[PDB]
Amino acid sequence: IQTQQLHAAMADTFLEHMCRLDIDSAPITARNTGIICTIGPASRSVETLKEMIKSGMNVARMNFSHGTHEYHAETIKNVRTATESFASDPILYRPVAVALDTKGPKIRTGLIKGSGTAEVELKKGATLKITLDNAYMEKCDENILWLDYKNICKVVDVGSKVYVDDGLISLQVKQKGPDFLVTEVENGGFLGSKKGVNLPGAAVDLPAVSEKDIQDLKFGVEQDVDMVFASFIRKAADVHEVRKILGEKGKNIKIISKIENHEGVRRFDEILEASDGIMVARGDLGIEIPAEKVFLAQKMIIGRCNRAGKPVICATQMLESMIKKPRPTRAEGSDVANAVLDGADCIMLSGETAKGDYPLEAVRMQHLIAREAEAAMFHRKLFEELARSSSHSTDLMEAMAMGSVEASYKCLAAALIVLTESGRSAHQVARYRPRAPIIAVTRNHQTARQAHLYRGIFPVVCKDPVQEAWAEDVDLRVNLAMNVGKARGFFKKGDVVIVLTGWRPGSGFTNTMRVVPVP
Amino acid sequence: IQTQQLHAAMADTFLEHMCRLDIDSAPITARNTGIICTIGPASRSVETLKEMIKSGMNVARMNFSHGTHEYHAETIKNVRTATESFASDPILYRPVAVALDTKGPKIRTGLIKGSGTAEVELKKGATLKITLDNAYMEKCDENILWLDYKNICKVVDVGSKVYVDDGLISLQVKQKGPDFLVTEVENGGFLGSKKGVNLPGAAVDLPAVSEKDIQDLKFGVEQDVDMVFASFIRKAADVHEVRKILGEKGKNIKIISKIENHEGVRRFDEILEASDGIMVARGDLGIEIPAEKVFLAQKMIIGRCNRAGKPVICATQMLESMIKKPRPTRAEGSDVANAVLDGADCIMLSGETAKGDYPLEAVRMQHLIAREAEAAMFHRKLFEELARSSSHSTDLMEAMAMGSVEASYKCLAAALIVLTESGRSAHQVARYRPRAPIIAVTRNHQTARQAHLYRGIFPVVCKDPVQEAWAEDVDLRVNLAMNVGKARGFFKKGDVVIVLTGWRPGSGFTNTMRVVPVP
């Protein structure tokens, strides 16, 4: 039985491809999908972070929805300590990226009239007036409810729906006022204090970057974060504002736009054009749109991201049950596998690593499933279709990337080696989805850290000084890649690899491709 | 905005098809994937079952792992009471099938020494003797463990793994003895009394049908069940053995083989050939094989069943969290949607409807997700690949089915109407996956109930007597389907349907196809 689902790889049709999937066809060692871990109480100690790295974590995510600057600064310090605890061995060292996830725009209710812990009950068909009057800020009850969104009246019409407490309660706008809305309770429940509010189908005019977000983005520039996950992006202008706040000092920080509501989906193309990558933020997205539609948006977005060559992250509740249990449900294994088959560059753990009981098991399981689904991709068709989608472009590096990936298919190369400094050459190789891993050797540490955003890039930091003879400097980096690959078990002596390098020191991309045996 | 993802339907490639999935494209009313609900304490009252039927239940599953014959007979009687409560209106009556799911062969440990309610701790790296000596049957502990599987020594080698308590505990056979096993605790835990044992990769020679199973199968025959879900099917002989047990009285009862371990997967083709259908029983399957591999087996199995035209069920933990919560996780919505896209004819609920707090919510969510994913199928490609896969067959009924489905694609027919008595004509239409629903009108009540196993067959019982004039009998049955379709909102006057009928009373299949406007 061939490894890596290669029998299924040879199928003519997608049906026969599916039919040939073999549970006894062992995957390869290398795992191409990036794993993004939300760091929290369960995972922010240095020792646990070392174990997260060993288990497969590639990006550490700090959710600034909560936590002080001091707290997240400590977390980032602990991440970097754990990461550098491995730095003595350049051949085993794994770059770990650092991501800042902004709090973004939020709509919150007031305090329920009473002592605290108090609740009111909303019965279907009842009347509830929403009021912006700060006089009712702490006197919410069954008849009057205050929320912090001063402009809500301008963005809602009669009959539009208002969700409260993460969609648990739904309201329909019956009458509209200047500083109030009169609504009928469509779906009822018990309402507590300071709950989340969502406005499905509305063009929310809250600022793209709030005052807290500006402070947090400047903090992230100060802490040398590799990338920002920007919340509730509804339009390209929101990305532009985030970019302006990051400004010239943070020009190289990768901006990942989070798609979280209907407008972000409807305007997704302009957002994608303006972004460096995308996160499918399925939790809030499933509150804003019918949950049964989320997969449509997920697949659309991953497809379009794959088309543009831009990183896409699938996030939220992928292994939810592992917050409390050491093993995932069958639905969760299926969700991770199908996100990989969809084409997600990275998959994410939220509560599973922030606060749950089994963060390391969660990371390890995402790693195992990811390797299995990577082999099960139908690469020949995927490659043909990606090439068809990008055919209006005649970019020279895409030509080399496509030629190199084709060569890697034809001779079943064990890896592609890419010498890169901005990372773009490796990015363009990853875009055309080879099955073999991409060992990207770079002297730019931030390039290495950001590379985790691209499917299949295993970044290696070259710390050697520049060799005077360009050819010998190239051979140095290629041999670094050979040794890393041998140590990680991706290939051995006598295997075949594709090597992408620059012809001369002034070559602006890897314009040179070779089939080389491993020494 | 085109409905039913028809814009994505027109794409040239799978990538572009995915890129065109649009959350604002509304699905049709008809829902094709069958929903199989496990009935238990949370759902067996007559009134709740009426709600189950209205919310979308097509098959009632009785899990005979537990429950007395009296309990399940009462449950089945309540299912039939609820079902017949709609029978006064033939146009609104919905056939509801009744399925018996056998307990099957099981390996169980002994009682923990003392009360029996005690537990002992199995420490990783510790040693554990498995024993067949009935003296330790009730004196199980941390050092010695008794199993009721007398032949285990015959089917296990040194280095084999033994899982205990639903995979929570893992043992590796270090030394093999005459009536015992010396094992190392690879994965530890607290071992209670009388827990399940699994033997990954082992050819378990327990009987296909246990002593309990024979009694339960005869009980199901007396109860006039439409179908049996036969547990732990490992090979064709097991399906035959079950078929023999069902005998002459149960010759028309459909046998659905549950693939639950490695051997059933490895020997899947012969099992498929011998069965009427297949269940991807992901729970036990994920205990027997690495959970990260279950999706492979799922897609392979669904593909192969789709290839053969035989019903396939996806089962277990699809909406697991809904046992305790009123809405599913995003991983669960993804799981259901991808099961439908895989091509599963039916999706299943177990604890979610048997015992959970939100059974009706689970049914409703499966129904909504199924409709959205059905629209998102890539019908043109699926049809081409199914046809290519079956191209060595020149069967006349397949020819009629493919022509009818092709015509239904071309003119966007609102439905296909198929007059059938054995069901085979409707089965062959459903096999070639039209997007429009299949209204199968039959005088055979059992055919109507069993048709629920096939994607898209909406079965309708004709209770009228046979008309002397064949043409008038045909028109009677066709108008019944038209009236059901209008009442269910599947089409209205002026829409177009495909109608498949027999030319004369002696036609052995629907050899006549028409494109008809809805009156």
Next chain:
Amino acid sequence: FIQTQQLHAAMADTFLEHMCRLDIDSAPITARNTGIICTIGPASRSVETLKEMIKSGMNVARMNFSHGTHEYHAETIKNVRTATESFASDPILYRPVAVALDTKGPKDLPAVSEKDIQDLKFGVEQDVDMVFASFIRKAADVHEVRKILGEKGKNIKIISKIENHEGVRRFDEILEASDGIMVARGDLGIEIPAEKVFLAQKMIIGRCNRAGKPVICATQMLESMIKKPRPTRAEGSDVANAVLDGADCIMLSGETAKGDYPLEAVRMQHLIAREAEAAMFHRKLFEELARSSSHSTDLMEAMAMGSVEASYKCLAAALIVLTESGRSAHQVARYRPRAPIIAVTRNHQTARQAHLYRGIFPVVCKDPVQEAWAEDVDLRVNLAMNVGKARGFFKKGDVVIVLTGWRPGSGFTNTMRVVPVP
């Protein structure tokens, strides 16, 4: 042993493997789907020669009005009709033959000259089945020909001849206006660089296939056979590749009009057509035609696609189509089954014009309309059974697709059946 009709190649996954599987020992079927159009002139206008030309496979007779008086072509047409009707006693074996008038056209010139107007009116008076309109340059020329044919010739199919650069560049509007197209390669090869003709040919056939409108490939197909009894290798190749391109009909000009070997030329076109028809890649072609027409949801198109699909699946020996305007049969032929289409009609002009469509074998039912709709439908369906058995298309126990109207007022064949041959 060896599958017939290039069916082994039919099962191929790629076009390359389809080529690699072409087997000179895989026998074609008896039926020949590509229409044969013969220019009649001195070598072929006698009643006896025309009888043998029908028997050899001529389906359409073309009168080239570049030269000749009305009296001369009138007599040619009379002899055509005499030879044709000599077979009319046997309705099972009678073969309808269409009569086509090819206008002289421009020889800054107007689309339709004064001579051309008189000739077109003559064609109306002569009851021609179709007009081949020379040097069509734009849709307006087609509209002129249509107005000149007027109400009396409103049923005369207008086949525009694409003969220069402008006609190619403006081909889409011409095709929209036309009932069909001829790739008139003689003049086209002079008006545009000869080495580009194949591009034009392949483009035009493709677009006509996309539309379901008849396309004729014409001129010098078997040129050397004017003076020689056997074709050159390039000429056999040219006929075969014109069939593979998708031509509904292939044409003979001097080869039958004035050459020494008219019958041999017709027979050679018949043989090559039959072999090339089997060598088509039907699965991909059907998929690509369906893809191209998917914005249409027409009901008869759906019936045609479903019936062609069913005929592929069960390898039906034929599709039997009951039709009066021909449209039902035209829609079936458009989706290119490999099996012959036996179109039974009571409209004689319909039967004659059906030759413009690949695979339509027209059969004129002469019995009177039966009182019961079901019995009249069986009458025409059994007419087709008897024709197919007599012509060697099928025998008892074979499977045929049968397309009929359900009830008397059906506006198309809305009923499809898979039927055993009696």
Next chain:
Amino acid sequence: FIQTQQLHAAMADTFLEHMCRLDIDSAPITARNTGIICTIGPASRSVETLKEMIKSGMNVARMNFSHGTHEYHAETIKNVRTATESFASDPILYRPVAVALDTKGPKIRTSKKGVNLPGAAVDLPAVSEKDIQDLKFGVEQDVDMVFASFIRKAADVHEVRKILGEKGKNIKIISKIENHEGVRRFDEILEASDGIMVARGDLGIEIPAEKVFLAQKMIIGRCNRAGKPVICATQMLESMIKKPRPTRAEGSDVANAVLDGADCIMLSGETAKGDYPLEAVRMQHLIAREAEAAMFHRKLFEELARSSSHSTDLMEAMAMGSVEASYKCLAAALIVLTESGRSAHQVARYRPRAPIIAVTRNHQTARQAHLYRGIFPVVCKDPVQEAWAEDVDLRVNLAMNVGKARGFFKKGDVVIVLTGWRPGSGFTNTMRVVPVP
């Protein structure tokens, strides 16, 4: 506003839409990939006419030993070589010309026309005594290839191979398929042969004429599948023996033979004895260029890759990667440094639309490369530089200057360059996207 070289049709999703987009106003490129093979005879064997034949595009000269003495054909070959070398002073513009020997094979003669017996068990030998003498004469004359008439089985090919023996071991054997048995036993014949000719003259008599195209498309397909050269021959422009312009069926035939995938097309009487040999060569050159652009390269590449997917050969990987890159960036050429020819052959099998400039120091490699679609061979006569990189750069720049001189590309255009990394590299393991200097 109108793409060249049928690039709009190149973007189609289906074969049908690819046909519908074929555009007579889309200009083809200057380079012509299909090799042109000319039979030399009384109408064309003079040194001056042969110069004009080279300039019109003749790539291979064919000596038909059905008639003529050794001395006569020796003189024809001598004149070919004189005409060819008259251009050798300029290595940038020198065009290698291959010499081919076409054996007489079995014949039946009666005034003394040939006789054909379809379906007869002709007892004639595979290789006659005259055939043996002519093959040895070809070895003595340093012919680049042999067209072996009437091969019926692999054993016939093996006989010709043995007769050529060790002294002629590099002479390419092109089996001529011209009767039913050769078609039926084609797979073993292809395996044993270096290439194939579809000898449609004899084939159209030995099998029913209406079946010839079936054989032609089958054979070209299988030869394309194997990467072995296939020639389409006989009566492609027959009417041009006596007329200055071809018939429509003849233009169609040449164009469809290129579309089928034939590496070469041939002229026999049209150049051997006809009144318009130069015109026949020029007509094939023009039609080839138009049909070459009209190929459906994307589907063709997918299907060739699919049929060869069981191979993981490294040079195949380089060729497929280089051709894929040449499609993506619309490169004007692929430059291939080769000595045996194998690397360039492997590129040619995967059918780029851009021309393949094969730079070699092996003169016979250069002459034989004309059997492969798109290989424009260039003879490097410079001495070997001491530094490998400098020698590679020297040959690559020779190719640059050739492409600039021939109008294939200009400064600032993009080319794919296939070279060996080190002198002992056994194939072109190095690919670059390079700007033209």
